Amino acid sequence: ENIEVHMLNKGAEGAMVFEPAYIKANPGDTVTFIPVDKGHNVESIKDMIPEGAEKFKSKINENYVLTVTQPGAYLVKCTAHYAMGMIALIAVGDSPANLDQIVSAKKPKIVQERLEKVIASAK
Ligand SMILES: [Cu+2]
Numbered sequence: 001e002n003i004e005v006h007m008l009n010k011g012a013e014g015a016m017v018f019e020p021a022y023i024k025a026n027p028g029d030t031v032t033f034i035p036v037d038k039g040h041n042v043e044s045i046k047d048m049i050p051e052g053a054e055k056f057k058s059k060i061n062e063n064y065v066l067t068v069t070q071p072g073a074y075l076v077k078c079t080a081h082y083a084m085g086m087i088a089l090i091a092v093g094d095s096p097a098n099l100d101q102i103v104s105a106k107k108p109k110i111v112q113e114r115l116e117k118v119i120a121s122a123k
Contacts, residue, residue: 002030005088007040007078013114016081018042018088021114022122025068025092033064040078040086042066048075048102050092068092073099075107075115085110089118 003023011017023031033042042064043057050072057079058064068074071093078086085108091099103115 001025002032004032004034006034006036007042007086009037009039013117014085016040016078016084016086018076018078018086020122021088022118023088023090025090027069027071027092029068029092031066031068031090033058033066035061035063039080041080042076042088043079045075045077045082045087045107048073048105050074050096050098072096073102075102077111082111083108085114087111087114089115 003025005023006019008017008019009015011019025031038061041058041060044055049055050070053070056066068090073096074090076088076090
């Protein structure tokens with residue numbers, strides 16, 4: 001199945017967001033990132049994707065289709081706006097083994113604040 005995500009300058013949670021920011025999927029699904037506003041892209045964060053998954057980075061303003069294979073949690077960012085909180089959590093399969101690790105990992109405060117909301121207020 002396919003899940004569409006919009007990359008925006010302003011959305012329900014504030015400035016620079018992915019909508020939705022919480023994506024549930026299964027091995028084999030695709031996630032399509034659509035740059036509704038310009039200046040955005042998607043990139044996997046180091047140490048924040050499952051063991052065995054390949055890292056990825058799309059070009060700015062391009063539509064990007066990510067195929068997810070490995071189960072686990074993935075924290076992705078917009079390269080340009082990571083420090084402004086622009087992230088999404090993907091979640092492949094049930095009880096992703098690396099979720100608690102990603103929540104504990106070092107990252108900007110604003111990012112941590114949004115992650116915590118997406119896990120609570122979206123689960
Ligand atoms: Cu961005």
